[PDB]
Amino acid sequence: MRHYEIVFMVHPDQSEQVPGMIERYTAAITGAEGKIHRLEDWGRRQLAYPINKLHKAHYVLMNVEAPQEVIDELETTFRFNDAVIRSMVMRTKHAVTEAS
Amino acid sequence: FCRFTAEGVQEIDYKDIATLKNYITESGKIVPSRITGTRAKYQRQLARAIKRARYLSLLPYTDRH
Amino acid sequence: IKVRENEPFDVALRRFKRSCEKAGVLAEVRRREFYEKPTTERKRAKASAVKRHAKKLARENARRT
Amino acid sequence: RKQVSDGVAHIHASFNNTIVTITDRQGNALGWATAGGSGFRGSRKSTPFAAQVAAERCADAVKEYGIKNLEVMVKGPGPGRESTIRALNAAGFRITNITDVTPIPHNGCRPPKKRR
Amino acid sequence: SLSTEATAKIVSEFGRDANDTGSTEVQVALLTAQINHLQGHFAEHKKDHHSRRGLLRMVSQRRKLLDYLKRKDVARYTQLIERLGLRR
RNA sequence: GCUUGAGUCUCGUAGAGGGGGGUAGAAUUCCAGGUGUAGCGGUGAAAUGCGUAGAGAUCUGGAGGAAUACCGGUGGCGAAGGCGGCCCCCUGGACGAAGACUGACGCUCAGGUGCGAAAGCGUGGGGAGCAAACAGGAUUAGAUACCCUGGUAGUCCACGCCGUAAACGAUGUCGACUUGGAGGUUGUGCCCUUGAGGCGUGGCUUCCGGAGCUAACGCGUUAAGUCGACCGCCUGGGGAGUA
């Protein structure tokens, strides 16, 4: 099916929600017959500019494969969630493994 | 000069920010290919890696951040 | 752009970084969208740049001195 | 009063006039002087010498605050912008940083028409 | 438009075999699927004039093949336009 | 009948091709607050304008609109008009390698049909900046202009209308043929990828020049050379692309 390269940052003060947030997303993916290729979390790293007067966001890479209407429910989840700033749904022809 | 991206068969992705900071100048602007000597195909996808890294705060837009 | 150098004070080392692209940009955003003259000036530029290439290559025959 | 030690010296560097002001690290101002208020009016407001007299007139009336070190911010394509800073290190200051903070739009609002 | 498994499907019913992919009968039925699918694209958006030229190119291409098939074998022409539904 | 024209398919590749939705940063303006004090702004000079009711400068926060620095390239794509941040969805064409397939299905068209910069128009929004008109200040013999300070339609969005440009390469479309050189961009084959190497081969594109052509300027394998197919068009200047 379609390949995707999702990277979304998370509000620091909610970093203990992150392994809960991660398994929330992949349960919707593999429960809709979705392959997964990566879960490479990068931890809290320094921003280049302040996103909403704030530094040191928590970065989460997924790089998952899903049908395009299943992921269409996923970015609107990133909209209505204050703990997520700057999602980025993306794409390659052949999603891959460890890259950083 | 030459293009090291054409020396290999790799792909310039936005996540490899260690090799992108020698392609921007000291104020965040992209260095032209007439200085660096990159091929025109890889220079076009290099700026697509600069612009995606600027969105995800891995690289700054200006130096006033 | 940002010089926080030590020792003896002499911007001298500042105008190297600053007169690079901090006045040509502000003098051309100074007025007029142009929308088509950039094109004219741009296309007049490189017709005079290859005028420096195709004449100075043909100027190395002799110099009459 | 507050007797602050380190400050910031912003330099506005328009074509017709140069404004130099002195603030602190927090960003609220202390004193200012312009080239139009130093006795230079009209054609002589656009002179680097008039930006020097605006600097030493601003280097005074901040003796009340006791600044010995300051940063330098320059903004605008002015005829001053560097003769102003030479009138500050000669005035007994420790210039830690000199920074260009001129506003460059990444292509935004439309400028006016070229005058003929 | 007209993905790879769909193009392999149409060449089976209209062609002689799976490798007879160029005949005048399979070409009309292949263009008809690309015509009929892009009506859903041009139901909405409607202002895609740069893509409608591609549709109008293959609409006029199908008429130039149907006029050729009527000139060669009229028995296969009446067989084909009934099998798709054509002539207004 | 045949496969060489034309077209289909199988793999790929590049792209500001188009339509729809989201979103980011820089900057202008405005609003609010802090600090701060007599100037700011503008010009060849000056004034109008702004400011002691606290401007301008500076800092924090907010609102909103439009445009996407650097990359950016006699670079790319599109039939032309045209198209530049980033991400997704839908979608058009071009091109290359190796084959397979249909078998002249082609070329060009009066009328017709569609597309078609900017300005303008209609209805409904939006309105930062810019800015016809208009208003004031200058300059001037006069200035109805150039310059200055303001500033409304308009520029923006949706849906229609308009159907015009120095809409230009001032060069219609298609096909064939005829010395070269330097490049750009984008596929691909082989050999020692043994090294950004060497040899090729396509597509589009820029420049300079040979023959020949042209009144000359120039054009020159992307012809304005040598030919063929069809179409549009021209017939002294004004009157007039007007009645």
Curated annotation (Swiss-Prot), chain B:
Q: Give the UniProt record's GO annotations in the biological process aspect.
A: cytoplasmic translation; translation
- Reply yes or no: does the keyword Nucleotide-binding apply: no
The record, for SUPFAM superfamilies, names: Ribosomal protein S18
The record's section on Gene3D superfamilies has: Ribosomal protein S18 (4.10.640.10)
Spell out the GO cellular component terms annotated for this protein, sorted alphabetically and separated by semicolons. Answer: cytoplasm; cytosol; cytosolic small ribosomal subunit
Q: Name one GO molecular function term.
A: structural constituent of ribosome
Keywords, in A-Z order: Acetylation, Ribonucleoprotein, Ribosomal protein, RNA-binding, rRNA-binding
Q: Which domain of life is it from?
A: Bacteria
Subunit structure, interactors included: Part of the 30S ribosomal subunit. Forms a tight heterodimer with protein bS6.
Q: What does this protein do?
A: Binds as a heterodimer with protein bS6 to the central domain of the 16S rRNA, where it helps stabilize the platform of the 30S subunit.
Enumerate the HAMAP family for this protein.
Ribosomal_bS18 (MF_00270)
Which family would the database say this protein is a member of? Belongs to the bacterial ribosomal protein bS18 family.
Protein name according to UniProt: Small ribosomal subunit protein bS18
Look up and give the organism this protein is from. Escherichia coli (strain K12)
List the gene name.
rpsR
Swiss-Prot record, chain C:
Alphabetized PANTHER family for the sequence:
MITOCHONDRIAL 28S RIBOSOMAL PROTEIN S21, SMALL RIBOSOMAL SUBUNIT PROTEIN BS21
Pfam families hit by this protein: Ribosomal_S21 (PF01165)
- Record's protein name: Small ribosomal subunit protein bS21
Per the record, its GO cellular-component terms are: cytoplasm; cytosol; cytosolic small ribosomal subunit
The upper taxonomy is: Bacteria, Pseudomonadati, Pseudomonadota, Gammaproteobacteria, Enterobacterales
Q: Where is the composition biased (Basic residues)?
A: 43-56
Q: What does this protein do?
A: Probbly involved in recognition of ribosome rescue factor SmrB in stalled/collided disomes; fusion of protein fragments to its N-terminus decreases ribosome rescue in the presence of SmrB.
Tagged with keyword Methyltransferase: no
Segments carrying the region annotation (Disordered) are 40-65
UniProtKB/Swiss-Prot annotation, chain D:
Q: Name one GO molecular function term.
A: small ribosomal subunit rRNA binding
* Family matches, as InterPro entries: Ribosomal_uS11, Ribosomal_uS11_bac-type, Ribosomal_uS11_CS, Ribosomal_uS11_sf
A GO cellular component annotation here is:
cytosolic small ribosomal subunit
Q: Is NAD set as a keyword in this record?
A: no
Keywords of the record, alphabetical order, are: Methylation, Ribonucleoprotein, Ribosomal protein, RNA-binding, rRNA-binding
Q: Which residues form a coiled coil?
A: none
BP terms from Gene Ontology: cytoplasmic translation; translation
Could you describe the subunit structure of this protein? Answer: Part of the 30S ribosomal subunit. Interacts with proteins uS7 and bS18. Cross-links to IF-3. In stalled ribosomes contacts ribosome rescue factor SmrB.
Please name the PANTHER family in this protein's record: 40S RIBOSOMAL PROTEIN S14/30S RIBOSOMAL PROTEIN S11
Entry's family note = Belongs to the universal ribosomal protein uS11 family.
As a miscellaneous remark, the entry gives: Has been predicted to contact the N-terminal domain of IF-3 based on footprint studies; exactly how IF-3 interacts with the 30S subunit is controversial.
Q: What does this protein do?
A: Located on the platform of the 30S subunit, it bridges several disparate RNA helices of the 16S rRNA. Forms part of the Shine-Dalgarno cleft in the 70S ribosome.
This chain's protein is named Small ribosomal subunit protein uS11
Q: Which organism is it from?
A: Escherichia coli (strain K12)
From Swiss-Prot, chain E:
Q: Which CDD domains match?
A: Ribosomal_S15p_S13e
Disulfide bonds, which pairs? none
Q: Which Pfam families match?
A: Ribosomal_S15
Q: What does the entry list under GO cellular component?
A: cytoplasm; cytosol; cytosolic small ribosomal subunit
What SMART domains does its record include? Ribosomal_S15
Q: Supply the InterPro entries for this chain.
A: Ribosomal_uS15, Ribosomal_uS15_bac-type, uS15_NS1_RNA-bd_sf
Q: Name any one GO molecular function.
A: rRNA binding
Q: Which UniProt keywords apply?
A: Ribonucleoprotein, Ribosomal protein, RNA-binding, rRNA-binding, Translation regulation
Annotated GO biological processes are: cytoplasmic translation; regulation of translation; ribosomal small subunit assembly; translation
Signal peptide bounds: none
Induction notes from the record: Part of the metY operon that extends to pnp, also has its own promoter.
Q: Looking at the keywords, is Transmembrane helix present?
A: no
HAMAP family reported for this sequence: Ribosomal_uS15_B
Q: What does this protein do?
A: One of the primary rRNA binding proteins, it binds directly to 16S rRNA where it helps nucleate assembly of the platform of the 30S subunit by binding and bridging several RNA helices of the 16S rRNA. Binds to its own mRNA, stabilizing it 5-UTR and preventing its translation. In the E.coli 70S ribosome it has been modeled to contact the 23S rRNA of the 50S subunit forming part of bridge B4. In the two 3.5 A resolved ribosome structures there are minor differences between side-chain conformations.
Record text on subunit structure and interactions: Part of the 30S ribosomal subunit. Forms a bridge to the 50S subunit in the 70S ribosome, contacting the 23S rRNA.
Family membership noted in the UniProt record? Belongs to the universal ribosomal protein uS15 family.
Q: What is this protein called?
A: Small ribosomal subunit protein uS15
Organism encoding this protein: Escherichia coli (strain K12)
